[PDB]
Write a protein that binds this ligand. Structure first.
Ligand SMILES: N[C@@H](Cc1ccc(O)c([N+](=O)[O-])c1)C(=O)O
Ligand SMILES: N[C@@H](Cc1ccc(O)c([N+](=O)[O-])c1)C(=O)O
Ligand SMILES: N[C@@H](Cc1ccc(O)c([N+](=O)[O-])c1)C(=O)O
Ligand SMILES: N[C@@H](Cc1ccc(O)c([N+](=O)[O-])c1)C(=O)O
Ligand code: NA
Ligand code: NA
Lengths: 310, 310
């Protein structure tokens, strides 16, 4: 499995593969990702940090942008409190094993030269395009604010100012990234990770929607969250439990079952798991049990590293 | 005529009179106005500079903002060229007799503290309100840009950052000023001057609509412009020639006429002129002739001061 294929594993799209292949030849190459700081760090975050680790193992210098200023524009509170949550997020990401450079957006996003280019980009970006780019990111607001259309330009200029080779994010970011590729003289390679479904199956996993597993949830919390989750027999699309099996579990995987329900089942790949589940050969309750227990084990070192701090 | 009434003369509104009366008691008081730099300086500009002179004679420190950065946001070109036109505008205003402090917006509008407050205001300003405030200011654009909604916040923060007591502008500015009075902790007194009608009577006088008299137009140019202008007998509303008589001419005024059309007519006030014109006792052609000749004389020292430079 080449470095390209390691990077591509479990991504939704790379814009573009040819461009990534050219970046991979260089000795010095940088990848970055920004996060609005979040009170809880969940599996959606972890999926993305795992992708940054892949890039790091492929020789990329990694930068994690603690996006305090964009969080501010997106109505998450006061900068000082946002920054505090940002420092906590850094600790969690470090507990996930990511050794990287962490920078607050506001360290550079208020520089006169940054601002002037934001205003320069504002002349080239229609209100219509800016709002469309924010549809999956902007806080719900019946009276949308000017801040909502500043946010995407801020993000677009961020890739430019810092000179990054590769930008990583969830698929929600793809319209802002498309805008950046259209407006900036250097085209940034964009790696988009899938958006995980919330545990109740009704929307996307989100720290503000209460439908997530946090990386530091207790084992009994993880078990109860998964026990309650949407997981219809034979359906994989929009099935959060199957997504967790796909994106976080190591294979081969042994699903423990009572003898009276078939006894223990060993699954050599997610793909085999998907066949078993689609064929209603594997029952939701047994899938849930295996997913819960293997997820607890995967998250335990993170939870424990954070616990050692207390 | 008290200082208050001198200031109020020929204004469309003061927001608010009580607030202005309190400002007038202070020893130290500042008034400012911003202009997007303009290739030609016209009677609309002059009307506003005349109002600033009134404020100066009432003891106000006067600041003229050469609004290079807002002009940039409003698609008037590159900053360097905008700034050059700004320096020309300063010379014209000086030739009008205005001794004041001239500052380019960009000297302070890119400071980190300015920018942060712009983003702070962007959180409090809806897109809907921002666009409505720009309806009479924004360049025509079938695909409105993010820059259009940054502009009004920029202007709102300008009154705050510099600590001005009084903001002056045309009535086109009144929604931005209303926004500033709602959002800022110190309420700025707003003096709004009337918007002059264009010479063809179809819209407002504008340096981009070719419907203006420039302060440095030649006498034959002024004569031809006025000769062609909309000026229907007995109609004053939307009559640019009557507006020029109201806002620029000194009274008493002697309208020269051939004996066969009544001979010379002396008019002691604009109000008397309006009666004569409404009663179709004064013919458009004779009004035009007097307005043209008296306007030439009023503008001559300006034209001549600018000519001396060549
Ligand atoms: N939009 C990202 C945060 C983000 C990503 C990348 C960025 O460059 C910036 N930024 O500029 O502040 C911000 C999110 O939804 O969490
Ligand atoms: N508000 C949109 C986009 C969005 C999704 C999830 C979120 O957590 C946030 N947010 O809080 O910024 C925003 C929605 O509900 O789909
Ligand atoms: N809006 C004014 C220009 C202006 C007036 C006042 C101001 O404070 C600023 N500004 O902030 O740049 C700009 C015009 O239409 O010409
Ligand atoms: N574009 C609007 C507002 C406007 C009026 C006059 C103007 O000169 C400009 N302009 O050029 O910025 C803009 C209109 O035509 O009414
Ligand atoms: Na080498
Ligand atoms: Na005194």
């Amino acid at each position: 499995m080449d470095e390209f294929e390691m990077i591509k594993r479990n991504t939704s799209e790379i814009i573009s593969e040819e461009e990534l292949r050219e970046v991979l030849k260089k000795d010095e190459k940088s990848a970055h990702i920004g996060f609005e700081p979040s009170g809880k760090i969940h599996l959606g975050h972890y999926l993305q940090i795992k992708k940054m680790i892949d890039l790091q193992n492929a020789g990329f210098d990694i930068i994690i942008l603690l996006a305090d200023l964009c969080a501010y524009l997106n109505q998450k509170g006061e900068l000082d409190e946002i920054r505090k949550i940002g420092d906590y997020n850094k600790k969690v990401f470090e507990a996930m094993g990511l050794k990287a450079k962490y920078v607050y957006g506001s360290e550079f996003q208020l520089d006169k030269d940054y601002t002037l280019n934001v205003y320069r980009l504002a002349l080239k970006t229609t209100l219509k395009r800016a709002r469309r780019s924010m549809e999956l990111i902007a806080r719900e607001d019946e009276n949308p604010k000017v801040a909502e259309v500043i946010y995407p330009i801020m993000q677009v200029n961020c890739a430019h100012y810092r000179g990054v080779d590769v930008a990583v994010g969830g698929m929600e970011q793809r319209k802002i990234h498309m805008l950046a590729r259209e407006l900036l003289p250097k085209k940034v390679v964009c790696i988009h990770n899938p958006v995980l479904t919330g545990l109740d199956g009704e929307g996307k996993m989100s720290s503000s929607k209460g439908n997530f597993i946090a990386v530091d949830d207790s084992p009994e919390e993880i078990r109860a969250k998964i026990k309650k989750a949407y997981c219809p027999a034979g359906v994989v699309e929009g099935n959060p439990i199957m997504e967790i099996a796909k994106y976080f579990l190591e294979y081969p995987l042994t699903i423990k079952r009572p003898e009276k329900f078939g006894g223990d089942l060993t699954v050599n790949s997610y793909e085999e798991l998907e066949s078993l589940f689609k064929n209603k050969e594997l029952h939701p309750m047994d899938l849930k049990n295996a997913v819960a227990e293997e997820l607890i084990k995967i998250l335990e070192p993170i939870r424990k590293r954070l616990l050692e701090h207390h």
